[PDB]
Short mmCIF file of C-alpha atoms and ligand atoms in Angstrom, two decimals:
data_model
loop_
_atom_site.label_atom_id
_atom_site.label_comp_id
_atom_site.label_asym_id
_atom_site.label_seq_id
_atom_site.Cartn_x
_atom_site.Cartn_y
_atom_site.Cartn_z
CA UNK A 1 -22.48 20.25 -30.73
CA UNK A 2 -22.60 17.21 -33.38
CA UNK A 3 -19.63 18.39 -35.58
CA UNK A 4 -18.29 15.77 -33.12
CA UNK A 5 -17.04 17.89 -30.26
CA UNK A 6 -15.08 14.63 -29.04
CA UNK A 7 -12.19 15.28 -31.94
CA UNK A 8 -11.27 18.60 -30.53
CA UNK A 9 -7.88 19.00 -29.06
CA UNK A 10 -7.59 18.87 -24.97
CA UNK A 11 -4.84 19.68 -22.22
CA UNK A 12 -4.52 16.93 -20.03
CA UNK A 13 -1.62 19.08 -18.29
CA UNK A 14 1.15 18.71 -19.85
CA UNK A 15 -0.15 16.15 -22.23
CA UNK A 16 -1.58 17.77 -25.48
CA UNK A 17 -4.37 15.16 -26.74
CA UNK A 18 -5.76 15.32 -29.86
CA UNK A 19 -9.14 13.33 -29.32
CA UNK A 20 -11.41 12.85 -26.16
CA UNK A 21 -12.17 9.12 -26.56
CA UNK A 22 -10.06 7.05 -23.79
CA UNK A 23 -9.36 3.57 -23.15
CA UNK A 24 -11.19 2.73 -19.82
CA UNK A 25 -9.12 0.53 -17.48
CA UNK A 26 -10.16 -3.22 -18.14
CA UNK A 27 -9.15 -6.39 -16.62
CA UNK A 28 -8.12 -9.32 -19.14
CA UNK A 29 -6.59 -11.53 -17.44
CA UNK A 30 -3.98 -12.45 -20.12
CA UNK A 31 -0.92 -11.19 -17.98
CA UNK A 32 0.49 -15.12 -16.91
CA UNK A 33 1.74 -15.02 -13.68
CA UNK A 34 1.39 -11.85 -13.41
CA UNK A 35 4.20 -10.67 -15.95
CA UNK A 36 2.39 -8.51 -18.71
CA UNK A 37 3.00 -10.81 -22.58
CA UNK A 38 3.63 -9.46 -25.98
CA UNK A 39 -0.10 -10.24 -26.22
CA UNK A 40 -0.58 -7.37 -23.77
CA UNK A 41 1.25 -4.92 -26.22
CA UNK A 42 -0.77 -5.98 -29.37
CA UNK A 43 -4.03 -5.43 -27.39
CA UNK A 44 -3.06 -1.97 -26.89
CA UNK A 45 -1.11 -1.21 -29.70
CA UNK A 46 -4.14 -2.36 -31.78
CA UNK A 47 -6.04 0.62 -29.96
CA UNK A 48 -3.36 3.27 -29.73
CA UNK A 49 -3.87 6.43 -31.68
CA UNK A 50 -1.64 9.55 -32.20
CA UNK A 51 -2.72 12.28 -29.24
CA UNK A 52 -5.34 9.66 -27.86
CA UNK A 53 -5.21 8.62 -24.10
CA UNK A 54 -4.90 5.28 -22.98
CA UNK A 55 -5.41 3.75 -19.06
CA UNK A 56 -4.15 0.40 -18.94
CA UNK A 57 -6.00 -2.76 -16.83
CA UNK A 58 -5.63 -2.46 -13.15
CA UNK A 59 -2.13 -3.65 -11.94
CA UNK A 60 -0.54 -5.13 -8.78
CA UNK A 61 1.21 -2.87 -6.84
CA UNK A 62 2.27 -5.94 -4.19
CA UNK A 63 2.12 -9.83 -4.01
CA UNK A 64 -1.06 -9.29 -1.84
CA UNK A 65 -3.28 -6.84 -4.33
CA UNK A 66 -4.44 -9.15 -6.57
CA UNK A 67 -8.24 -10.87 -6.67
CA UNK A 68 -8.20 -12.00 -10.35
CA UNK A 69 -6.03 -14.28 -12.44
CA UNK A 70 -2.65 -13.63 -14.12
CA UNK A 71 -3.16 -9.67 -14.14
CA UNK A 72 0.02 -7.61 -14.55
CA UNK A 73 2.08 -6.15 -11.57
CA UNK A 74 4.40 -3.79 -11.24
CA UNK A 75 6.40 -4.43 -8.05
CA UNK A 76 9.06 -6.75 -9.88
CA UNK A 77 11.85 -5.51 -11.77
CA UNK A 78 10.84 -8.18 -14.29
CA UNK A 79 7.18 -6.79 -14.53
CA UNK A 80 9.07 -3.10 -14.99
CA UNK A 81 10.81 -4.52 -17.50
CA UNK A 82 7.89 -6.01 -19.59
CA UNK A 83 5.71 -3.47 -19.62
CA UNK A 84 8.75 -1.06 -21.00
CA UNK A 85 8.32 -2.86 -24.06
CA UNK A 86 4.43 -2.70 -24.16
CA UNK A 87 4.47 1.48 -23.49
CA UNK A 88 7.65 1.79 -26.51
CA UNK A 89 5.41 -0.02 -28.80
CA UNK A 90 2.05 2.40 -27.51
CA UNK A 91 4.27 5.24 -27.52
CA UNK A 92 5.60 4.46 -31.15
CA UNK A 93 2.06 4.74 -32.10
CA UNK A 94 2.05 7.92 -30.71
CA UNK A 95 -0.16 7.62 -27.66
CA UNK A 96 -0.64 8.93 -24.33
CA UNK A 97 -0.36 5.68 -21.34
CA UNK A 98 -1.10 5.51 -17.51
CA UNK A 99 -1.05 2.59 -15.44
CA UNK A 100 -3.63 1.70 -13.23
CA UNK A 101 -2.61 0.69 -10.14
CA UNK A 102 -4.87 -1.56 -8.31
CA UNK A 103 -5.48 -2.92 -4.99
CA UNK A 104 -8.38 -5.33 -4.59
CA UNK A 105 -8.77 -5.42 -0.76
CA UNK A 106 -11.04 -7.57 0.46
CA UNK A 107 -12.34 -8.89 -3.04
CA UNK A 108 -10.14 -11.72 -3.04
CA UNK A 109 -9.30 -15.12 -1.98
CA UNK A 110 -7.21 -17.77 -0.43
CA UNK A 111 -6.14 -18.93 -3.71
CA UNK A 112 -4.98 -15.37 -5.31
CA UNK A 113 -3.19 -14.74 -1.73
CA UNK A 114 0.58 -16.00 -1.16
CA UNK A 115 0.82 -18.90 1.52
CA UNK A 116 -3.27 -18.70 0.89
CA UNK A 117 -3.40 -15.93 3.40
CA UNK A 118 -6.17 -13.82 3.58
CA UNK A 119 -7.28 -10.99 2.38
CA UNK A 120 -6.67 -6.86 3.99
CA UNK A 121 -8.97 -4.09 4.02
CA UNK A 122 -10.34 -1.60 6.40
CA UNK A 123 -13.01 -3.63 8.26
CA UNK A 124 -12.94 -7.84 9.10
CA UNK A 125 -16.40 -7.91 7.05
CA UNK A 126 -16.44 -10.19 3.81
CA UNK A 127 -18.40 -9.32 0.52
CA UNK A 128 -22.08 -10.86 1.02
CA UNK A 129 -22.74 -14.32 -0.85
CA UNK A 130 -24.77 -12.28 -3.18
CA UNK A 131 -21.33 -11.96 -4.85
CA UNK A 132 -19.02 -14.71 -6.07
CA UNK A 133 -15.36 -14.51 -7.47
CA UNK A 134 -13.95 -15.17 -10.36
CA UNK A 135 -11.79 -18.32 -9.45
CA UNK A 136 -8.29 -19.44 -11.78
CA UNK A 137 -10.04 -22.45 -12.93
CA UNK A 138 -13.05 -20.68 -14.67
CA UNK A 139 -15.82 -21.30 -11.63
CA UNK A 140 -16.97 -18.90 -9.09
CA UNK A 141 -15.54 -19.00 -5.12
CA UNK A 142 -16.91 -17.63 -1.77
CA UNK A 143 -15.31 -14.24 -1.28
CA UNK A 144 -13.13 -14.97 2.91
CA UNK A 145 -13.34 -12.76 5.64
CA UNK A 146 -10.77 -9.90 5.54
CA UNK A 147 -8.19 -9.23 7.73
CA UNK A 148 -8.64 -5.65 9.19
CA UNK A 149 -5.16 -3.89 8.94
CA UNK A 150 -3.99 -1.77 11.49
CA UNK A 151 -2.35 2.06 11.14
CA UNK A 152 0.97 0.96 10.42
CA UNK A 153 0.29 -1.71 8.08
CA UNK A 154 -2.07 1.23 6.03
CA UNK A 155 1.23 3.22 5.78
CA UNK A 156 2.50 0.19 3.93
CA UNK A 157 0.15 -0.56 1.72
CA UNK A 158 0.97 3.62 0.95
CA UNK A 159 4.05 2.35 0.16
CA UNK A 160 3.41 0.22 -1.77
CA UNK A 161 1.39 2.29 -4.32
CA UNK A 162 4.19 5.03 -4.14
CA UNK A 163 6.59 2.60 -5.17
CA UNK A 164 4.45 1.10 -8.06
CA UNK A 165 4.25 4.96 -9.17
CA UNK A 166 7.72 4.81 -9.70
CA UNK A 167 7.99 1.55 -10.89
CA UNK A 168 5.76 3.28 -13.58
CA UNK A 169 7.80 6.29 -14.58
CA UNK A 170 10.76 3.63 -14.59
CA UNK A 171 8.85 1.67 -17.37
CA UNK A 172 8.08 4.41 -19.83
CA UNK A 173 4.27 4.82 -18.85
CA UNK A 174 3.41 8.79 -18.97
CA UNK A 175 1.51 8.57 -15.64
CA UNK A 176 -0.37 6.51 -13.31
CA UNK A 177 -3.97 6.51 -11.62
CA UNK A 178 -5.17 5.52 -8.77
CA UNK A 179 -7.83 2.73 -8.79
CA UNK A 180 -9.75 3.93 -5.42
CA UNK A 181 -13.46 2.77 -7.38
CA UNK A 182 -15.43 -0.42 -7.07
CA UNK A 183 -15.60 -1.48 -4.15
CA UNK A 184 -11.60 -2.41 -4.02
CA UNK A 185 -9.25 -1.71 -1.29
CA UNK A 186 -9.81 2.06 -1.31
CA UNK A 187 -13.44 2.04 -1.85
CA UNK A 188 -13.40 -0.45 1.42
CA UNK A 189 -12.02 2.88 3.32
CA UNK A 190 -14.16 5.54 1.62
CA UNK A 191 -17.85 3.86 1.70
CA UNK A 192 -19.80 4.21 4.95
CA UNK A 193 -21.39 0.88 4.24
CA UNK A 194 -18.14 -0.67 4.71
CA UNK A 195 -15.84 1.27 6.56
CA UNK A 196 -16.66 0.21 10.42
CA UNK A 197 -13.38 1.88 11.65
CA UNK A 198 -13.44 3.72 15.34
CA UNK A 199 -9.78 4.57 14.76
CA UNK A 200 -8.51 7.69 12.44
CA UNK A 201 -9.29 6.04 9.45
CA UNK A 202 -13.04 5.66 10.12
CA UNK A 203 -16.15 7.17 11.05
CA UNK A 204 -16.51 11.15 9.75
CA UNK A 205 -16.40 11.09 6.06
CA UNK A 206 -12.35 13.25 6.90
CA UNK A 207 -11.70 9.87 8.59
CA UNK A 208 -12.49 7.70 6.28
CA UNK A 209 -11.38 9.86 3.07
CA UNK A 210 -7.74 9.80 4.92
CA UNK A 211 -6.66 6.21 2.94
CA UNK A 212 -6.96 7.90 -0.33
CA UNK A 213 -5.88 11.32 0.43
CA UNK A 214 -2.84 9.98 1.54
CA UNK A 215 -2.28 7.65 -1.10
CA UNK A 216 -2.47 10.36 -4.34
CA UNK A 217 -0.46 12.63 -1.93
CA UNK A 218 2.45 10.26 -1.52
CA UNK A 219 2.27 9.09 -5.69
CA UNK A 220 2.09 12.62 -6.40
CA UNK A 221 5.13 13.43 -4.28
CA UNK A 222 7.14 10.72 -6.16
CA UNK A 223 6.34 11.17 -9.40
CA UNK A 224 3.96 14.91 -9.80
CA UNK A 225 0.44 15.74 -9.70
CA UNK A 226 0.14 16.21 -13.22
CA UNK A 227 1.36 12.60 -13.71
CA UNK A 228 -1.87 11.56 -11.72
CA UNK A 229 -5.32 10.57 -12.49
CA UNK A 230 -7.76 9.32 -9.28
CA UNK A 231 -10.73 7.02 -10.35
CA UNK A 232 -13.56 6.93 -8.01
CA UNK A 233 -17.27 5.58 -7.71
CA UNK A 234 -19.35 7.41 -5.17
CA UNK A 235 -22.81 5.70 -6.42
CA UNK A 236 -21.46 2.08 -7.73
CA UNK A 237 -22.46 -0.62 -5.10
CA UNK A 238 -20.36 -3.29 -6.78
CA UNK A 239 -19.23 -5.50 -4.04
CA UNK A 240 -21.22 -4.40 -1.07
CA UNK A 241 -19.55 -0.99 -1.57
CA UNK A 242 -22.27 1.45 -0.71
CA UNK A 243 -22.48 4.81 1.08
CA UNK A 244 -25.42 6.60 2.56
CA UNK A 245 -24.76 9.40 1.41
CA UNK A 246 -23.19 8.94 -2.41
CA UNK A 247 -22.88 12.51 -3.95
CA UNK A 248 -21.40 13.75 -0.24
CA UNK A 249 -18.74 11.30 -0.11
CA UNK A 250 -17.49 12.20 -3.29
CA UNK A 251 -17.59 15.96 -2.83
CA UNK A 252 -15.35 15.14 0.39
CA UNK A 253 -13.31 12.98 -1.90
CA UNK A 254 -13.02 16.63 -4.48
CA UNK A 255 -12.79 18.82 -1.62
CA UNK A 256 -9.08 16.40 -0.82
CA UNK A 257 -7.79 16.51 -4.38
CA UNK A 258 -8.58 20.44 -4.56
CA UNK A 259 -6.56 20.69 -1.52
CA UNK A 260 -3.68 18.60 -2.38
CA UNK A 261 -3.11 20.12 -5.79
CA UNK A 262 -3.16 23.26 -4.11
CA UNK A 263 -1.06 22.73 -1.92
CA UNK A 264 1.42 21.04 -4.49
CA UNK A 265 1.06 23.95 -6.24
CA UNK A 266 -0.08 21.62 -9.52
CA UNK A 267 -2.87 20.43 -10.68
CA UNK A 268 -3.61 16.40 -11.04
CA UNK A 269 -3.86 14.94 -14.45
CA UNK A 270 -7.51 14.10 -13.98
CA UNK A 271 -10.83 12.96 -11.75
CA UNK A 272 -12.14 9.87 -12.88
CA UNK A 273 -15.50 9.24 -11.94
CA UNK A 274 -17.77 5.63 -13.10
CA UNK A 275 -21.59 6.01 -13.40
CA UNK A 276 -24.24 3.73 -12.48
CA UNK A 277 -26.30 3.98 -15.25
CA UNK A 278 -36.42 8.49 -16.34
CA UNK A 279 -35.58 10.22 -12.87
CA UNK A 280 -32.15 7.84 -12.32
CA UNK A 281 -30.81 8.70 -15.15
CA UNK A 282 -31.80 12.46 -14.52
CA UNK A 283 -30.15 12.06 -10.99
CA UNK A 284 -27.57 10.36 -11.79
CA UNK A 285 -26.46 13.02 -14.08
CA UNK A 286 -26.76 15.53 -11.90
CA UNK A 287 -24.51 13.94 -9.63
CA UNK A 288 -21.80 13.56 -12.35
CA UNK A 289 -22.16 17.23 -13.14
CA UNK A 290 -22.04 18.33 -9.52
CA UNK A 291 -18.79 16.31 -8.88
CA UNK A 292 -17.01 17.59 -11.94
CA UNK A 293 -18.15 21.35 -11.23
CA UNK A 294 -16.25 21.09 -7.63
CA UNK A 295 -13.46 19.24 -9.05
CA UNK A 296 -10.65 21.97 -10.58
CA UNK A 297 -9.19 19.86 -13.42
CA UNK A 298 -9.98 17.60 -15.73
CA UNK A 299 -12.79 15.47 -16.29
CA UNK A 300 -13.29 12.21 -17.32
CA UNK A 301 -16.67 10.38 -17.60
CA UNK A 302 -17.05 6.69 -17.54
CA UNK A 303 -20.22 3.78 -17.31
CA UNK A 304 -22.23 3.01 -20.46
CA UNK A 305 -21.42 5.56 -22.63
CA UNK A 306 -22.22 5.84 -26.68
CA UNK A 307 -20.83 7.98 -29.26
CA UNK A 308 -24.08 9.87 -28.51
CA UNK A 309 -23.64 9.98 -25.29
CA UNK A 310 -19.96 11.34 -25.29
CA UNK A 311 -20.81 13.62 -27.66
CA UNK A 312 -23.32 15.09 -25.80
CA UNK A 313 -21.10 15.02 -22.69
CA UNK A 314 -18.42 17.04 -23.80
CA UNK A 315 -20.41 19.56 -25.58
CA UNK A 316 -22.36 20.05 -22.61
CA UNK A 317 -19.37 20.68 -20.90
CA UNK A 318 -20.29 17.82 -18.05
CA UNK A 319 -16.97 16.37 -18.87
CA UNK A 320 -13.51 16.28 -20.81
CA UNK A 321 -13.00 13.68 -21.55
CA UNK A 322 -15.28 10.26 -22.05
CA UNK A 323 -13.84 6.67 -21.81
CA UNK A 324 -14.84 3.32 -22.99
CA UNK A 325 -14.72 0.10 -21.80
CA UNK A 326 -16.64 -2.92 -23.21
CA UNK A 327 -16.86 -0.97 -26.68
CA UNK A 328 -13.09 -0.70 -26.70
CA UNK A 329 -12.69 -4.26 -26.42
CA UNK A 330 -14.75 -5.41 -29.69
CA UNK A 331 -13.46 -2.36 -31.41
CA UNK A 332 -10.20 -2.14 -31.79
CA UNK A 333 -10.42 1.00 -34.05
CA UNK A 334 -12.90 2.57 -32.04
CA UNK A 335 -11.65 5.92 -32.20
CA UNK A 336 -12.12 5.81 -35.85
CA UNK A 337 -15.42 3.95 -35.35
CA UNK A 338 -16.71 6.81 -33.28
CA UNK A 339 -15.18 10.08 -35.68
CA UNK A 340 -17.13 8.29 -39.03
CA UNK A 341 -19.56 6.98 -36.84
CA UNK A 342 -19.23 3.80 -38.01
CA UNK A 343 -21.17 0.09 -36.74
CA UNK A 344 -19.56 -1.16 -34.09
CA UNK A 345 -18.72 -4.82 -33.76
CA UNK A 346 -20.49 -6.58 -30.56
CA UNK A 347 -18.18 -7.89 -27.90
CA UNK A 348 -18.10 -11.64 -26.20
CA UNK A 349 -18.79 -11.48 -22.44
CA UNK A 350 -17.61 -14.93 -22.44
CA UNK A 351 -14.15 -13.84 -23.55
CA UNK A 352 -13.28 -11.31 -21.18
CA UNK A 353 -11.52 -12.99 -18.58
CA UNK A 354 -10.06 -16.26 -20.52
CA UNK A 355 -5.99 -16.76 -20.70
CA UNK A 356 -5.63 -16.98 -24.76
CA UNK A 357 -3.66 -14.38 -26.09
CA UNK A 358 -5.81 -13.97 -28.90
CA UNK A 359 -9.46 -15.10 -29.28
CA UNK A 360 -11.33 -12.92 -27.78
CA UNK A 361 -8.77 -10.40 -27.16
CA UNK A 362 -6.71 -9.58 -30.59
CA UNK A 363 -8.69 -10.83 -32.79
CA UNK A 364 -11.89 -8.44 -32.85
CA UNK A 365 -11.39 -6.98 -36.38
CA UNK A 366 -11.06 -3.22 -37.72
CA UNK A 367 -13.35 -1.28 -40.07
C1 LIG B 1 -14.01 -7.14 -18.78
C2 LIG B 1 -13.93 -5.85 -17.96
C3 LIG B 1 -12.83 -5.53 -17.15
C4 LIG B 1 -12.74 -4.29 -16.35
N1 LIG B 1 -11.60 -4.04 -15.59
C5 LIG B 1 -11.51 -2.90 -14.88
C6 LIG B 1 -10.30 -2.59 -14.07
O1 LIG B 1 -9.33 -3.34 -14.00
N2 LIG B 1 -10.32 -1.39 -13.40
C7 LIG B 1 -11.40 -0.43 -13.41
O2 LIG B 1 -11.28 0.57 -12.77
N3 LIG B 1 -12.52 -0.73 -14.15
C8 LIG B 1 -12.61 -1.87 -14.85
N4 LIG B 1 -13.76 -2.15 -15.63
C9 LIG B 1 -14.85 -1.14 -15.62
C10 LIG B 1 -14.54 -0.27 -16.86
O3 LIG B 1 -13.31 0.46 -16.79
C11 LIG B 1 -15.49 0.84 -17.26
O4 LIG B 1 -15.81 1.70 -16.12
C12 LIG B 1 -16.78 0.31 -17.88
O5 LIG B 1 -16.43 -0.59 -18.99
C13 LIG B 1 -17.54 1.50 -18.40
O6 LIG B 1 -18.79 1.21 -19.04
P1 LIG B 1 -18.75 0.80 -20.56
O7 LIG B 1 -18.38 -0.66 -20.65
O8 LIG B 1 -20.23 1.04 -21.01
O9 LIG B 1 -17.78 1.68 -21.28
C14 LIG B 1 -13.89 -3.36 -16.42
C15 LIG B 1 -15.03 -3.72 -17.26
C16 LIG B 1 -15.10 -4.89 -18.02
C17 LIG B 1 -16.32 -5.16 -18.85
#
């Protein structure tokens, strides 16, 4: 229970880890251009451990997927051939790596769009003004109104994350998982409360839980299921990106990945859920516990988590594993932090999405 149940060993398919604390995919915005920097490699180097499991930021899997500055892509040879050098200095260290792959949809603008085109996702309605993005020169834009693909541009953008997947492997990275949480392009499919589709991609929650299901089924098909890890967020409404009915769109979202690793006769490397985070807390717990029970793999918890709180997590059995996001990023030996319990250094909001390759993003110091 407290002899620190989060050091025990864990399967992850056919990767043996030797801890349960993981890296939680996080945006930093130091990958210029797009192209992932040595800075990119000391970041995660500095947070590699031997057996422990690492998820990368979100990445571009085409020119038109990104909605934040200079974050790294995959759909160039040169990007490929970057981030080889980042995973063979992670890997030396003895860690586990998957790339996110990421697909903003809608939560973009003209300026992160080539030719200032706008934006795709699954419906021609924007993000409401009560949300403003990030722009390149530090200040805050209007999010445009989408374009609303049609059924063969969807098969692209399938594509696209298939390739990416391979683009992956091709780069050293272990695996890869599929970003389908806040509100982003997949969400934009998933959530009732944006998903205004009277095609086969929208209405019944089968409809509009095709986009994903065919997007881990073609990544899993090019590189394995147990290469795969799915991120969702059933009860997030970041971005406009709500559902009616939260906990029963993501049981429809198990019941697919239960299917497709059955029929691919392997299981996927993991279910990913983020919490929201008294009776909500209660609820939302519940929730979490529910989805993991009907998933048939691994878990792995995520959303303002403590050492406490992982602890208690895993030993419960409500998940298998626990990542960590803002903690991660102000401790850059948090593993360690978190098996002597040790303080934990606080981390600068204000540095999160700058361009240095250092302050605020090397240079949080170890125990
Ligand atoms: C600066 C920053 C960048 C993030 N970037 C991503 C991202 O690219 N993809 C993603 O799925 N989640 C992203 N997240 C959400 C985190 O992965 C994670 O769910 C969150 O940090 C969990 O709560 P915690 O900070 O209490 O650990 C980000 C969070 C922060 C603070």
């Amino acid at each position: 229970d407290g002899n620190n149940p989060l050091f025990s060993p864990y399967k992850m398919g056919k990767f043996n880890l030797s801890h349960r604390v993981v890296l939680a995919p996080m945006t930093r915005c130091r990958a210029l251009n797009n192209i992932p920097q040595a800075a990119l490699g000391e970041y995660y180097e500095q947070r590699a451990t031997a057996g422990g499991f690492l998820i990368t930021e979100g990445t571009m899997i085409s020119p038109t997927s990104a909605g934040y500055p200079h974050v790294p892509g995959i759909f160039t040879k040169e990007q490929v051939r970057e981030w080889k050098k980042i995973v063979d200095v992670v890997h030396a260290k003895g860690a586990v790596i998957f790339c996110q792959l990421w697909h903003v949809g809608r939560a973009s603008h003209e300026v992160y769009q080539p030719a200032g085109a706008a934006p795709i996702s699954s419906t021609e309605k924007p993000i409401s003004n009560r949300w403003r993005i990030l722009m390149p020169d530090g200040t805050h834009g209007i999010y445009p109104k989408p374009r609303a693909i049609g059924t063969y541009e969807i098969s692209q953008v399938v594509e696209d994350y298939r390739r990416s997947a391979l683009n992956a492997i091709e780069a050293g990275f272990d695996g890869i998982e599929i970003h389908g949480a806040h509100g982003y392009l997949i969400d934009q499919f998933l959530k009732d409360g944006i998903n205004d589709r009277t095609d086969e991609y929208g209405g019944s929650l089968a409809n509009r839980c095709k986009f994903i299901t065919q997007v881990v089924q073609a990544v899993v098909s090019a590189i394995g299921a147990d290469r795969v890890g799915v991120r969702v967020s059933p009860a997030i409404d970041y971005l406009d990106a709500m559902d009616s009915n939260p906990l029963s769109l993501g049981l429809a979202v198990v019941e697919r990945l239960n299917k497709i690793q059955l029929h691919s006769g392997s299981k996927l490397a993991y279910l990913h859920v983020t919490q929201p985070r008294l009776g909500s807390e209660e609820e939302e717990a519940r929730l979490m516990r529910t989805l993991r029970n009907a998933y048939q793999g691994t878990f792995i918890c995520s959303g303002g988590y403590t050492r406490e709180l992982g602890i208690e997590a895993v030993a419960q059995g409500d998940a298998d594993l626990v990542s960590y996001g803002r903690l991660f990023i102000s401790n850059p030996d948090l593993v360690m932090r978190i098996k002597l319990n040790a303080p934990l250094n606080k981390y600068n909001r204000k540095t999160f999405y700058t361009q240095d390759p250092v302050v605020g993003y090397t240079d949080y110091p170890f125990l």
